[PDB]
Design a binder for this molecule. Sequence first.
Ligand SMILES: O[C@H]1[C@@H](O)[C@@H](O)[C@@H](O)[C@@H](O)[C@@H]1O
Length: 301
Amino acid sequence: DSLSKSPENWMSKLDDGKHLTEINIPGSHDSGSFTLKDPVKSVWAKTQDKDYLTQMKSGVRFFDIRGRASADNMISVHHGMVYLHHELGKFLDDAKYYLSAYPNETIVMSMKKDYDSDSKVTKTFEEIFREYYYNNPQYQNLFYTGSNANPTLKETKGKIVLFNRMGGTYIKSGYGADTSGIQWADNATFETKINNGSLNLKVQDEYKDYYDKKVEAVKNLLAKAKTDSNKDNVYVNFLSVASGGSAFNSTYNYASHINPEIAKTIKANGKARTGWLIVDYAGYTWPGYDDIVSEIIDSNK
Ligand SMILES: O[C@H]1[C@@H](O)[C@@H](O)[C@@H](O)[C@@H](O)[C@@H]1O
């Protein structure tokens, strides 16, 4: 019986000793944009329709969280200048609940500054996150705090793994958790060594692409992962694409076709390594076409 049919805890069904790197993970791009209702804002700033807990119930384990310091102790979730109507607390509290109810899953959480801090803010984004969230008492036991750069599933069971997109940081656990952070190339397919050289991150993040290009970039990186047995390589590619104006053109209209297209490829490829794939409108189904989150889930042994 395929893993898809039980996406509330497919990771529990996996060999503990695999590095998260090795596991093919479903991710949601701009994970918290589900709260947006505005029809015009939604064509470009909205990337999901399911809330956090539902995303998790549907099997997504990589959450792309973008934030803005609103106060010296609070980080607002954002798609750029657009406030997505909740603080980071909403996500972490949602992660805590789920992780207890399904103690054999792990969540990787990407953290990024997406917009400038309020005028009344004293501290840096990194300081506010590190000191009021990463090691806030209320979430002790929640984050990974080990010292392994390439954590095993067993090591992270029941925890959030920091994926550090904040620049340099004093947090000492997670991917890119050092004073260098991650070297992110704008609108590109790139490689960069992270965690002191102990990991080679590989990203397809060509978000300005048009349809043909995007699908090609997704599939090019996808094919490289198919071959790569290396536990020290990380693969993250976003199927997601920046919309246009108009709505036509909208984020959903892209995801509505990119997701199924990449979904058919993956299933055809049998069980094989895919890397971490980050999608818009995860959990969104269109009858007749394959589900990208399901085929990602099903490609793990
Ligand atoms: O442009 C932004 C940002 O620069 C991210 O790195 C990219 O991955 C997103 O997809 C988004 O649209």
